RNA sequence: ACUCUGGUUCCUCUGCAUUUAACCGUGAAAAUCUUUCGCCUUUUACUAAAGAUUUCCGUGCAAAGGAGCAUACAUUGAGUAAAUUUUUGGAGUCCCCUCGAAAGAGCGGGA
């Protein structure tokens, strides 16, 4: 971000996808904490 | 009877994918310029909207050439195989009057 502050656009978007993914992932007995490994949405952002 | 060609899979070149309601992309970046908002003692890197252009990751089809695999001649464009009322298994023949040298023609007449 130091060398390209517009990259805050993608930083925000991966923060937004994490909330999207986690709150559907962490449902029922699956609690808070590590293990949410659905890496594909976040990966795509950085390829674009 | 004519000329027309082996299937598949892959590589690469060339051309085209504008009458967009909308869509070569059921996905989604970056830049430049112009303008308008917000940061700010400046510039860069920025905010977030508009308009105009670019680059980049990709897409489709046609056509040509080549490279691998196992193997088949047909088949495309041009063009093949019924004696019972309505058609293709005979209601057909023959003979007088008329106009005209000539040969036909009248819902002509007769067997
Ligand atoms: Mg100065």
Swiss-Prot record:
This is Pre-mRNA-splicing factor 8 homolog. It comes from the Eukaryota. Functions as a scaffold that mediates the ordered assembly of spliceosomal proteins and snRNAs. Required for the assembly of the U4/U6-U5 tri-snRNP complex. Functions as a scaffold that positions spliceosomal U2, U5 and U6 snRNAs at splice sites on pre-mRNA substrates, so that splicing can occur. Interacts with both the 5' and the 3' splice site. It is found in: Nucleus. Part of the U5 snRNP complex and of the U4/U6-U5 tri-snRNP complex. Coiled coil: none annotated. The MPN (JAB/Mov34) domain has structural similarity with deubiquitinating enzymes, but lacks the residues that would bind the catalytic metal ion. Contains a region with structural similarity to reverse transcriptase, presenting the classical thumb, fingers and palm architecture, but lacks enzyme activity, since the essential metal-binding residues are not conserved. Signal peptide: none annotated.
């Amino acid at each position: 971000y130091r060398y390209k502050y517009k990259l805050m656009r993608q930083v925000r978007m991966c923060k937004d996808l994490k909330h999207l993914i986690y709150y559907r992932f962490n449902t029922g007995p699956v609690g808070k904490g590590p293990g949410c490994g659905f890496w594909a949405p976040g990966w795509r952002v950085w390829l674009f």
